Amino acid sequence: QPIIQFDAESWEAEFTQEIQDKAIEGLESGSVLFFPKLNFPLLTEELKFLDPTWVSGAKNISYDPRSATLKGVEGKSEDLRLLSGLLKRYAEKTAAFLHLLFPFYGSSLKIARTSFRPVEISGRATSARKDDTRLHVDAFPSSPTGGERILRVFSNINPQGKPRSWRIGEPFQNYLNHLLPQLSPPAPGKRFLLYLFGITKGYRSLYDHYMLELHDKGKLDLEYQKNSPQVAFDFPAGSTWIVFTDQVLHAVDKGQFLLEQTFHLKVNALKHPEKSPLKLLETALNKKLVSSESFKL
Ligand SMILES: [Cl-]
Ligand SMILES: [Co+2]
């Protein structure tokens, strides 16, 4: 069940336990949780930001709710204030929503960066590794996770009713298996140099190395990209969806105007830690893949 549909239409309403169970079981099983009627409205003063020209240097404007810092956009103070207010509101509403929906995670949900993506996808072209029209799990070379989960909330806020077209691939375990023969260890000492040189924020654990390998090699495997099991789904304007994007194989084909909020979650906070990419990889390679892993007995 690659996509599980939910009826909630409000960012603040509570959920029954039955729905909460459906959500956490589906999320940890690698399904997309889809809320077709959960729209994120914009203020009239914010409608002018539905314009790709606000991006100045990147493809995404980003906000850190922890430090209240806005990046990727230039402009006058009042416009940066309004744009910060938009992404701050998305951070607050998605954070509240996740705490209503996933009480099992308690305070282990750690907010990370917000993004606003106003560039139309179909006009994109880049290196194969960054080509997000290729199925992948998320792994960022500059930002290792140390095994923590990448949990994202997405909202399509296109004002012309245009959907956001995704493809959703096969289960992580199948992906990992398919690509395993292609995986290779890192060159001795290399990850330490990337850390020493500031190329990576923190140290790239073995887990992060292998997720990058999956990410990259998977994107370069053209036969896999063409022939592997995958479903195409259009997320309508005014909808929201929630995904462990380090686990759900995904790709975007077209669309414009997306709000996205990233959260991090430690593996030990999961209901079924054994379903995590970390544990699956540690089982497949029979080794500990993150060095400061808490030790248990
Ligand atoms: Cl529901
Ligand atoms: Co992605």
Residue with tokens 């994109």: 124
| Cα 290 to averaged position of ligand 2 atoms, centre (Å) | 22
Is 253 annotated in a binding site? The answer is no
Please report, in angstroms and rounded to a whole number, the separation of the first and last CA atoms in the chain.
35
218 vs 32: CA distance, rounded Å: 20
Strand partners, 33: 4, 242
Q: Is 129 annotated as belonging to a binding site?
A: no
Rounded distance from Cα 265 to ligand 2 centre (Å): 17
> Is 51 within any annotated ligand binding site?
no
Query: CA-to-CA distance for 117 and 62, rounded, in angstroms?
Result: 9
CB 251 within 8 A of CB 134: yes
- Ligand 1 mean position to 29 CA, how many Å? 17
Q: How far is CA 47 from CA 68, 69, 80, 119, in A?
A: 21, 21, 14, 15
54 is in an annotated binding site: no
> Cα(8) to centroid of ligand 1, in Å?
6
Per-residue DSSP letter, 36: T
Looking at all shown ligands, the one closest to residue 248's CA atom is 2
- Ligand 1 geometric centre to CA of 176 (Å): 31
Cβ neighbours, 10 Å, residue 128? 11
Whether residue 5 contacts residue 36, with contact meaning beta carbons closer than 8 Å, is answered with yes
Q: Which ligand is nearest to the CA of 37?
A: 1
| Look-up of token digits 């509403």 | 93
Radius of gyration of the chain (CA): 19
H or E element in which residue 88 lies? helix 77-101
d(C-alpha 153, C-alpha 245), whole Å: 10
Report CA(130)–ligand 2 centroid distance (Å): 9
Q: In terms of Cα–Cα distance, which of 153, 112, 146, 141 is closest to 266?
A: 146
Who contacts 208 (Cβ-Cβ below 8 Å, separation ≥6)?
Answer: 139, 144, 145, 146, 147
Q: d(Cα 118, Cα 157) in Å, to the nearest integer?
A: 10
Angle, alpha carbons 222-148-155 (nearest 5°): 70
Q: Cα separation of 3 and 90, whole Å?
A: 23
Q: Is 81 annotated as a binding residue?
A: no
166 marked as part of a ligand binding site: yes
Distance of CA 91 from the midpoint of ligand 1 (Å): 23
What count of other Cβ atoms lies within 10 Å of the Cβ of residue 78?
Answer: 9
Chain-centroid distance, C-alpha 23: 17
Distance from residue 281's CA to the centre of ligand 1 (Å): 32
264 has binding-site annotation = no
Which ligand has the shortest distance to the CA of 6?
A: 1
**Residue 10 phi, psi dihedral angles, 5° rounding:** -125, 145
Proximal ligand: closest to the CA of 35:
1
Burial pattern 157-190, b for ≥16 Cβ within 10 A else e, equals bbeeebbbbbbbbbbbbebbebbeeeeeebeeee
Instruction: Report CA(134)–ligand 2 centroid distance (Å).
Output: 9
DSSP 122-185: GG----GGG-TTS-B----TTS--TT-EEEEEEEE--TT---EEEEE-S-HHHHHHHHGGG--P
Q: Look at the alpha carbons of 151, 148, 279, 182 in this order and tell me if their dihedral is positive or negative.
A: positive
CA of 228 to the centre of ligand 2 (A): 17
The Å distance, Cα 103 to ligand 1 centre, comes to 16
